[PDB]
């Protein structure tokens, strides 16, 4: 099975260094395609510009029309369909707004209800969606 001699440690580290790439997490952490292929340029948050508002559908067991925003980024310049979280907020996210986006619970997968949305809206013109939903005074219109 293994190799258990006193001078076999080079063969051991060669075998482990070869077989360590087959894990998904190691290769997505130490392969450059998860920097040159993902959005954000490897960031956590990113500002963007509202391009359009898209009503997408839910999955097959669910039945809902989810409301999302196609976001033109500032750092990279790519297009991200980002999700409108709360009950309202479609009337609070307008065209050409400074929109901060983050993940849902995982960068790789998405939410099991929405097909192709990986990211979530937090801010609208330096005013958060929690502030626009409850508590604070008025929109920056």
């Amino acid at each position: 099975g293994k190799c258990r001699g006193l001078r076999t440690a080079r063969k051991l580290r060669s075998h482990r260094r070869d077989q360590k790439w087959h894990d998904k997490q190691y290769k997505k952490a130490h392969l450059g395609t998860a920097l040159k292929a993902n959005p954000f340029g490897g960031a956590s948050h990113a500002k963007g510009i509202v391009l359009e508002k898209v009503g997408v559908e839910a999955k097959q067991p669910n039945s809902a029309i989810r409301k999302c925003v196609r976001v033109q980024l500032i750092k990279n310049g790519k297009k991200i369909t980002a999700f409108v979280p709360n009950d309202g907020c479609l009337n609070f996210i307008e065209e050409n707004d400074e929109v901060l986006v983050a993940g849902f619970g995982r960068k790789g997968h998405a939410v099991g209800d929405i097909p192709g949305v990986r990211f979530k809206v937090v801010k609208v013109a330096n005013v958060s969606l929690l502030a626009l939903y409850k508590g604070k005074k008025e929109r920056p219109r």
């Binding site: 009503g55 559908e57 009950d87 309202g88 479609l90």
Partner: protein
């Protein structure tokens, strides 16, 4: 084709309810004292099968 007009439908159609004037709560250690006086060896009349912290 999915229309975007139904935004905040339940948030609009929800009847508003005025929050009634609830008295002030207790502090940190006072709230822990209330928890120890309420939900522990202070008052336990019944049998140890069912629990009643809210009903």
């Amino acid at each position: 084709h999915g229309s975007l007009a139904r935004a905040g439908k339940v948030r609009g159609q929800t009847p508003k309810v005025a929050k009634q004037e609830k008295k002030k709560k207790k502090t940190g250690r006072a709230k822990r004292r209330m928890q120890y006086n309420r939900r522990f060896v202070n008052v336990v009349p019944t049998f140890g099968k069912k629990k009643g912290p809210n009903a």
